[PDB]
Design a binder for this molecule. Structure first.
Ligand code: SXO
Lengths: 969, 71, 71, 145, 242, 96
């Protein structure tokens, strides 16, 4: 556990709150209109608060457009979104310049434990009847309860005389013991009321929080800090894609304007990581640091200890104690050292120490009580040592917080003890970061007690044990009695069918609305205005890519996971499941079976049995040599030319082979017949030229690969075609077939019922074409490996189009294969549009295709166009997050392979054939940039597609008015 | 259409009963397969007992109203 | 350093573009009071106007920042 | 990425797109990766699917949008899928090596059907319904066999 | 490239351990990475270099020469140099010979057009209205040979050889050395028909109006591998039979 | 531990804390384990814990205050765990 986990390269910065504000606004807007939020619930209010916290002028204009462009006559939901968004625009205008504030608006929830008649324990977080707002929560804390009693106006006025509020601040008496203090407690409760009503800001507050994973108090504290505008360095001991995505989602939800979230890997159990993290925080941005000075430290990192009594104190308890005490002291000292080296005496960091009210009262928690109790020495050390000016101690004695220990929270609430939720405890803790409590800590260290009055129950450990024992015995007795009653009833009286889903993969043809509905949206003057022969429509489409077909790729694109249909399609694509129909193990079976074991597999089980393999072998992942002919980028085979220094031992070779060797090497080789068998001995001499294989460690280990197990046989392409054509051609054939299926053209010759063979063109092409055939001709022929004599024609970029036409289409229509590097598919769509518009074709196969291979990968790495996988691993990036467009950290593109095809044609003919229309290709243009000496450098050349003249625009064109054009028509 | 054809060829209107219980089971099995195919998740079978098919028009109407995509 | 909490030697040596004075602790409060006491007094038309330099700084200001374009 | 955002922004600025109406930028290659010529075709497939479903997938790898992209006020960079109530048009833009810029526009299919009569639309719809049934039959048969 | 002595390499298994030969640290490490336990690499403390000793069973490549039967080609006249037309040595070192042929052809074609300065077209049309719709059957086959063979041999190959191999790279170099147009770029591949493809695409471009001027035509280069594979297909004439 | 403030807590302070707190807890655990393995419930060992009146009052003593203060958890652990019959806790707060 002391193993280092921190590294500077692995830190992730989240600061694009402007963009996240716009995204959150769109999400809330669409949820309201779609009815996911029928009323103004606290989630809607909280999302509005996040939008307000990120409010800026661009966000105001964004909201103004999206609420003014809303039409309110389209049902009450749109009127609701319009009025709510007008209110939000008003409220964001008010806080346009105001600092972002942490304002929690979720309903307070208490514990509820219920025992069913059959002895089933259910725990729920029901809303509290008495308390409904955070303001009311603060009032309840101030009031307290009977157990806390002992022998215009702020909430500190409403506290009863001779009482202990549930949340208070203590004061150290001259005797050295901490006692409840009315003044400090009143100040803290007043700060809590201000936070609950107005919200509390944390602008210009630099916080270091450890132990803020999902489901912790630290996570809620971090959410509040981000709401308030803090610059938070959050640490994590489980640094992964899941955790980074979780923290990104938190920043995109609660990251106020000016807030920055720095997620770093970290092991608080290692002092090397403690020092390295503090150095990274305090170092200048030039030296790879953040250049931050911490205003708060919240070291909530810990590991649990269960069933570890005194006799069980061991390695785990030592490591836990290190994390919870020793490395927190080291972290505090590291911050002190940084501030002192920088001469910072007037910016103390507020250390919010997580303290337990109970030090060994429960037991069996290893060394946890030792750590928490030793954490109180910092109060005296603050006065007795020379780090007071750099750190201020704020011990938060955290009470019972609801995350076993929840089923009895209702039971402990029955005597006025108050138990908190994660949100409530986080609010209590962020109340310690208010400016007034900050100044209090700076004047002297503070002991906040957020214990909810838990200290006043006598023998809390034994009471908790008795509560759990009572609940357990009740549940067990009820369960046993119910079971025995059921058995007795069944014995006395002697002895519902469930329907499981079955995958029904839909082609997802466009939904066709009623004519009135479809006419309402288009202008009334469009009827007969357009030349449908000149209108181009994408009739069909398909692809073969790292997530299989267009359907499965779209499922992972939009919803991030596969439905039953998508998962079954992926398993079938990968050959995980095959279809079986007939006798199987005697009984007759009809359905999916496992391809290897042939055992029946149900559709419901397909996900449970193949999801992990599907995800592991789909999308962007480590390059698989079995999919690229044993190409391992870690061991990239090479050959080095060397001069032979001494004659090699003779080796046998054929007559022809020996003659070729002699032709090559001249006098540097000796070839001799063997009269025994007629073969030849070849003896290379000193000075001969020689090639020794060598291997190179190449740093592009990840590619977007068609999912493992994809086979053209699965789609029905015969082995002869597979052996003839390249894998690129197979991808294109499968894409073409799936695209015609999406078009509903099950038989391609049905096009010839409507058009001439001359009127079906193919205008798709490849950036580089048959790279496998190029490798054949340039490398394996050089190596004299078996290569088909017609590998040349299999390398051409137009060969895949030829194979499409001469396996499926039989058309004599135009063939125009474009090359455009990454733009060949848009080039293809443009060429196909021009073909149909010219009338040389009526139907056109457009799209594009390419294959991933060793040499193309290596040359892209040579130009550094692709992302260096070793650099990504240094940054802690997985293959799934290697490709991150439009991000601050993007450092090269992620290479992939596959094909994409679209069947486009005239709108008139598409209607005549009765084919689906997925979209109208309204425009398709290509462009070059300008004069320069860099081929791969992008440019604004395509900007000409928006070229327009505005010298005289004082009046609108009659030509842009459709009524005028309809009049002329 | 398959369910209606099965009812036409296996359920006798004059006697208002299935000609054979095995035929009745056949039609019920087909309807259960329809429910499996067109249900999106776990759900109670609409035909819990085959005896409901004594009114096969009603059973088919219920099943294909619950799963109108199968019509 | 004692009065306004900044180093003229450091400013001469490094020419910082921005300089943040922090008002934390008793020393920071004393520096903040020194900053707040700074006034610009002007007898205009026989009236002694007292404008305040650093109008931002108050009892709740935790920091002030001197800004510059280049240094 | 910088060049493409700047190009899209200049197009919106010159065409006088309303302020506060950024185009929602879909980045497919975070998930699929970059094929060196299937790219525009994959994005066209995604654009058609966005048009038909009204759903705009988010760039789930958009951990933090680059700050330089904030200047392009007419571009939005979502990280999570958005269930819109409709997408009218989608602009597919590609930029290949060799200065190969390209822009295609796919409009929703339903703006086509407003250019025909009621009867022609009805007979077309019936024919697509029959074709859809036949294609479902063929697709599932071919999948299993 | 001498088709009478066409260079290949034959894989053989080492039958006896080779005499050690000196190599760099990195080179010897690459050899060890390749051959695993079939090679021993040892530092030389005298100079810090490494000695590489291939063992029995190691994999080894001996060059061999094949007599190929296509000895005659239609070749650009010997002494043709792009410098003679004025293309700088930096461009000659950057681009492929196919690109040089295309650049000279584009310049001579504009001269035949009487357009001495290509920007004079922008006196009449928009930069968006000048397209280039020429293309190649295989394009930069010299750069393909680079990436697939000389890169494999670890010979010095420019890091941007892949972009020099593309079929649209020649038209890109035309535009970004002479034209500066932002007009349509549509590079066709048609094997022997790419030039008629190009004329057809250019006609379509002008008729659609996305261009008013178009550079059409086609280009290809003769190289060892393309020659050999046409010979394997028997599409070319056998010179020995001739 | 002399002149070891918070910023100076290091290997020496960690080792001292181990001796003064952790290995004392281990020693009491070991005595508990021996007595329990031998079935000794009626002969507790009286652990005379050296406790300090001052926990951070002077400072500059490494983790001395932490060790001494955390040694007071044994009072509660004696009631809350199952080693009461094998060990009795006697915290002697040693004066000047
Ligand atoms: C297009 C989407 C826009 C939706 C925006 C609608 C909501 C807004 O305008 S948020 C503006 C800020 N509003 C608030 O802060 C109110 C929060 N304060 C409150 O007291 C209450 O709302 C709660 C605490 C949430 C509950 O109070 P209640 O019992 O409902 O009076």
């Amino acid at each position: 556990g002391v193993a280092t986990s921190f590294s500077r390269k692995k830190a992730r910065t989240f600061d694009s709150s402007w963009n996240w504000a716009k995204q959150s606004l769109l999400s809330l807007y669409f949820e309201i209109i779609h009815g996911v939020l029928k009323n103004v619930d606290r989630e809607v209010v909280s999302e509005a608060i996040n939008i307000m916290n990120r409010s800026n002028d661009a966000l105001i204009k964004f909201m103004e457009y999206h609420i003014s462009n809303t039409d309110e006559t389209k049902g009450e939901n749109y009127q609701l979104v319009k009025t709510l968004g007008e209110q939000l625009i008003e409220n964001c205008k008010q806080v346009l310049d105001v600092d972002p504030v942490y304002k929690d608006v979720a309903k307070p929830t208490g514990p509820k434990t219920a025992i069913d008649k059959n002895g089933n324990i259910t725990y729920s977080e029901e809303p509290r009847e008495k308390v409904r707002k955070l303001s009311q929560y603060v009032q309840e804390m101030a009031l307290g309860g009977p157990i806390t009693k002992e022998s215009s106006k702020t909430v500190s006025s409403t506290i009863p005389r001779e009482t202990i509020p549930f949340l208070h601040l203590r004061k150290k008496t001259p005797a050295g013991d901490w006692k409840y203090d009315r003044q400090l407690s009143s100040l803290f409760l007043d700060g809590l009321e201000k936070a609950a009503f107005n919200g509390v800001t944390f602008k210009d507050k630099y916080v270091l929080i450890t132990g803020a994973g999902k489901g912790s108090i630290g996570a809620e504290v971090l959410q509040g800090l981000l709401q308030g505008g803090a610059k938070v360095v959050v640490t994590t001991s489980r640094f992964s894609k899941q955790v980074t995505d979780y923290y990104q989602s938190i920043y995109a939800k609660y990251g106020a304007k000016g807030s920055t979230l720095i997620v770093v890997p970290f092991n608080q159990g290692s002092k090397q990581d403690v020092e390295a993290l503090i150095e990274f925080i305090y170092d200048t941005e030039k030296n790879g640091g953040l250049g931050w000075d911490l205003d708060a430290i919240i070291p909530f990192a810990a590991i649990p200890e269960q069933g570890i009594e005194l006799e069980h104190i061991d390695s785990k308890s030592e490591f836990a104690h290190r994390i919870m005490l020793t490395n927190i002291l080291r972290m505090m000292g590291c911050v002190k050292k940084q501030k002192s080296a920088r001469g910072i005496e007037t910016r103390p960091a507020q250390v919010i120490l997580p303290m337990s009210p109970n030090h060994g009262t429960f037991g069996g928690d290893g060394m946890y009580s030792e750590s928490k109790l030793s954490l109180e020495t910092l109060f005296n050390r603050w006065h007795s040592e020379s780090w007071a000016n750099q750190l201020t101690v704020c011990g938060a004695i955290i009470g019972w917080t609801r995350g076993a220990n929840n089923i009895i929270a209702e039971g402990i609430e029955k005597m006025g003890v108050r138990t908190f939720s994660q949100k409530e405890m986080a609010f209590n803790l962020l109340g310690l970061l208010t400016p007034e409590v900050v100044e209090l800590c700076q004047k002297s260290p503070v002991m906040a007690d957020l214990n909810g009055g838990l200290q006043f129950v006598p023998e809390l450990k034994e009471f908790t044990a008795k509560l759990r024992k009572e609940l357990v015995e009740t549940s067990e007795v009820r369960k046993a009695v119910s079971i025995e009653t059921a058995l007795e009833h069944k014995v006395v009286n002697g002895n519902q069918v469930e329907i499981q889903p079955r995958a029904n993969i839909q082609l997802d043809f466009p939904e066709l609305k009623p004519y009135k509905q479809v006419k309402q949206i288009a202008p009334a003057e469009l009827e007969g205005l357009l030349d449908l022969e000149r209108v181009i429509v994408v009739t069909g489409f398909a692809e073969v890519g790292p997530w299989g077909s267009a359907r499965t790729r779209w499922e992972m694109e939009a919803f991030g996971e596969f439905s039953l249909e998508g998962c079954v399609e992926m398993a079938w694509i990968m050959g995980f499941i095959s279809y079986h129909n007939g006798n199987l193990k005697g009984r007759p079976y009809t359905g999916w079976v496992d391809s290897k074991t042939k055992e029946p597999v149900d559709d419901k089980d397909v996900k449970a049995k193949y999801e992990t393999s599907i995800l592991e072998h789909s999308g962007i992942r480590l390059i698989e040599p079995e999919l690229f002919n044993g190409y391992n980028p870690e061991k990239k085979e090479m050959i080095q030319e060397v001069i032979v220094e001494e004659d090699l031992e003779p080796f046998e070779a054929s007559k022809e082979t020996a003659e070729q060797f002699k032709h090559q090497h001249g006098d540097k080789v000796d070839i001799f017949e063997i009269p025994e068998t007629g073969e030849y001995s070849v003896k290379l001499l000193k000075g001969a030229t020689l090639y020794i294989p060598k291997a190179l460690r190449f740093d592009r280990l990840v590619a977007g690969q068609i999912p493992t197990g994809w086979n053209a046989k699965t789609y029905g392409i015969s082995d002869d075609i597979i052996s003839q054509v390249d894998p690129i051609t197979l991808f294109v054939l499968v894409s073409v077939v799936e695209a015609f299926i999406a078009s509903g053209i099950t038989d391609p010759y049905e096009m010839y019922k409507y058009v001439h063979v001359s009127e079906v063109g193919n205008c798709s092409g490849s950036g580089m074409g048959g790279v496998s055939a190029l490798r054949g001709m340039f490398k394996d022929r050089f190596k004299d490996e078996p290569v088909q004599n017609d590998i040349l024609q299999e390398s051409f970029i137009n060969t895949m189009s030829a194979w499409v036409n001469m396996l499926l289409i039989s058309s004599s229509g135009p063939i125009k294969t474009p090359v455009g590097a990454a733009a060949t598919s848009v080039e293809s769509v443009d060429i196909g549009v021009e073909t149909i518009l010219s009338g040389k074709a009526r139907i056109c196969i457009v799209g594009g295709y390419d294959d991933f291979q060793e040499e193309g990968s290596f040359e892209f790495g040579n130009m550094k166009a692709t992302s260096n996988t070793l650099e990504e691993f240094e940054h802690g990036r997985t293959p799934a997050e290697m490709s991150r467009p439009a991000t601050t950290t993007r450092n090269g593109f992620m290479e992939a392979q596959g094909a994409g095809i679209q069947i486009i044609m005239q709108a008139d003919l598409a209607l005549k054939m009765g084919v689906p229309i997925y979209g109208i290709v309204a425009m398709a243009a290509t462009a070059t940039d300008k004069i320069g000496r860099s081929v791969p450098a992008p440019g604004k050349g395509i900007l000409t597609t928006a070229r327009e003249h505005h010298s005289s625009v004082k009046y609108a064109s009659p030509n842009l008015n459709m009524k005028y054009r309809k009049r002329q028509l | 259409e398959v369910a209606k054809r099965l009812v036409e060829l296996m359920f006798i209107r004059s006697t208002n009963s299935w000609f054979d219980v095995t035929w009745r089971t056949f039609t019920g099995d087909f309807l259960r397969r329809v429910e499996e195919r067109f249900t999106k998740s776990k759900t109670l079978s609409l035909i819990q007992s085959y005896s409901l098919l004594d009114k096969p028009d009603e059973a088919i109407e219920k099943v294909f109203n619950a799963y109108p995509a199968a019509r | 350093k004692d009065t306004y909490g900044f180093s003229i030697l450091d400013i001469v040596i490094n020419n910082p573009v921005n300089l943040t004075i922090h008002f934390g602790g008793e020393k920071g409060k004393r520096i903040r009071e020194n900053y707040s006491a700074m006034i610009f007094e002007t007898i205009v038309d026989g009236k002694l106007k007292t404008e305040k330099i650093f109008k931002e700084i108050n009892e709740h200001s935790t920091s002030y920042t001197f800004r510059s374009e280049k240094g | 990425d910088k060049n493409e955002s700047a190009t899209i922004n200049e197009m919106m600025k010159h065409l006088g797109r309303s302020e506060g109406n950024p185009v929602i930028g879909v980045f497919q290659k975070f998930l699929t990766g970059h094929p060196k010529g299937a790219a525009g075709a994959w994005m066209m497939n995604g654009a058609l699917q966005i048009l038909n479903s009204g759903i705009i997938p988010g760039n789930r790898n958009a951990d933090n949008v680059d700050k330089i992209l904030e200047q392009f006020e007419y571009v939005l960079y979502p990280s999570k899928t958005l269930k819109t109530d409709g997408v009218r048009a989608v602009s597919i833009t590609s930029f290949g090596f060799g200065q190969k810029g390209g822009q295609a526009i796919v409009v929703h299919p339903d703006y086509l059907y407003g250019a025909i009569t009621e009867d022609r639309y009805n007979e077309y719809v019936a024919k697509v319904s029959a074709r859809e049934k036949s294609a479902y039959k063929f697709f599932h048969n071919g999948m299993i066999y």
